[PDB]
Amino acid sequence: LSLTNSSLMPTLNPMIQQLALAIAASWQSLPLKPYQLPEDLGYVEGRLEGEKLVIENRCYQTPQFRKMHLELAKVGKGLDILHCVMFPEPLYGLPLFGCDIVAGPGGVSAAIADLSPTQSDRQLPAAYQKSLAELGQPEFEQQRELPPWGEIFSEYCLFIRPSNVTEEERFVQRVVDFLQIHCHQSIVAEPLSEAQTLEHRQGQIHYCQQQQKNDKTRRVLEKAFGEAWAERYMSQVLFDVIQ
Numbered sequence: 297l298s299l300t301n302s303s304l305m306p307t308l309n310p311m312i313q314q315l316a317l318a319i320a321a322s323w324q325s326l327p328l329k330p331y332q333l334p335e336d337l338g339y340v341e342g343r344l345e346g347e348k349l350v351i352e353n354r355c356y357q358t359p360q361f362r363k364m365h366l367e368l369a370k371v372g373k374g375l376d377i378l379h380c381v382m383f384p385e386p387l388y389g390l391p392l393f394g395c396d397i398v399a400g401p402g403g404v405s406a407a408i409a410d411l412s413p414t415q416s417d418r419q420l421p422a423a424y425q426k427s428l429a430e431l432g433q434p435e436f437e438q439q440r441e442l443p444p445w446g447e448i449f450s451e452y453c454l455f456i457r458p459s460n461v462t463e464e465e466r467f468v469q470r471v472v473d474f475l476q477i478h479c480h481q482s483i484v485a486e487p488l489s490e491a492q493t494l495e496h497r498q499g500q501i502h503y504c505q506q507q508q509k510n511d512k513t514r515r516v517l518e519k520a521f522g523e524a525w526a527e528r529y530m531s532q533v534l535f536d537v538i539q
């Protein structure tokens with residue numbers, strides 16, 4: 297979370313850099329422990345017939361968060377990606393924090409962030425609903441419609457192409473605000489009932505299964521590493537289905 301040793305960071309899109317710093321700052325003083333990814337993955341790169349893909353993975357856990365994954369990536373010289381998920385411990389019933397930012401030479405093309413539900417009714421907990429409403433409706437000029445698998449995302453999900461610096465900063469601040477709410481809610485949460493824990497586990501399984509339908513991510517991985525590698529990475533590293 298000291299992103300000071302990151303080889304990628306100095307070379308990434310400025311909005312990505314600010315988000316990475318914001319996420320690292322959110323996590324820095326938590327009761328962190330390492331979370332070992334499959335094969336204790338950290339840095340990885342690959343190429344097949346086209347551009348090289350370079351990826352840095354950082355991953356932690358706390359008693360409330362099963363797995364806190366920050367991924368940074370670059371395809372060739374110019375396509376930059378930040379991926380982050382905080383997977384909740386089902387025992388505590390917290391939503392899933394996620395964000396995905398994709399940028400090229402033309403600027404940021406996609407910025408997505410959410411606190412996604414795990415309840416069977418597909419609603420966020422009452423406390424989240426309240427705190428999120430209090431932020432107000434952000435104005436963004438270029439909204440994007442989620443794909444069908446994106447039914448997993450809350451009504452507060454952002455999915456935009458930022459139109460200018462003001463919007464980039466507004467999006468980053470909204471992600472900061474989501475993280476602030478999420479970290480606070482995490483400390484007022486108690487272990488839930490076995491039936492409730494099971495419900496929340498299912499919500500997290502479903503989230504991962506749906507995220508795996510994102511062909512935009514899959515194609516980037518496949519072009520650099522191939523089908524089998526990409527399937528392993530999506531299903532075991534990015535969106536692992538708990539059980």
Ligand SMILES: C=CC1=C(C)/C(=C/c2[nH]c(/C=C3N=C(/C=C4\NC(=O)C(C)=C4C=C)C(C)=C\3CCC(=O)O)c(CCC(=O)O)c2C)NC1=O
Pocket residue numbers: 367369377378379380381393394395396398405406408409410442443446455510512513516517
């Ligand atoms: C290896 C990691 C990684 C790669 C390579 C990656 C690539 C990536 N994700 C994308 C979109 C996207 N990404 C998501 C969302 C998410 N994606 C998430 O990983 C999470 C946690 C969310 C949501 C919280 C959505 C909704 C789209 C748009 C998909 C579409 O347009 O069909 C796009 C298309 C960008 C655009 O259309 O402008 C690419 C290239 N994303 C990645 O995370």
Ligand code: NA
Pocket residue numbers: 341350
């Ligand atoms: Na390299």
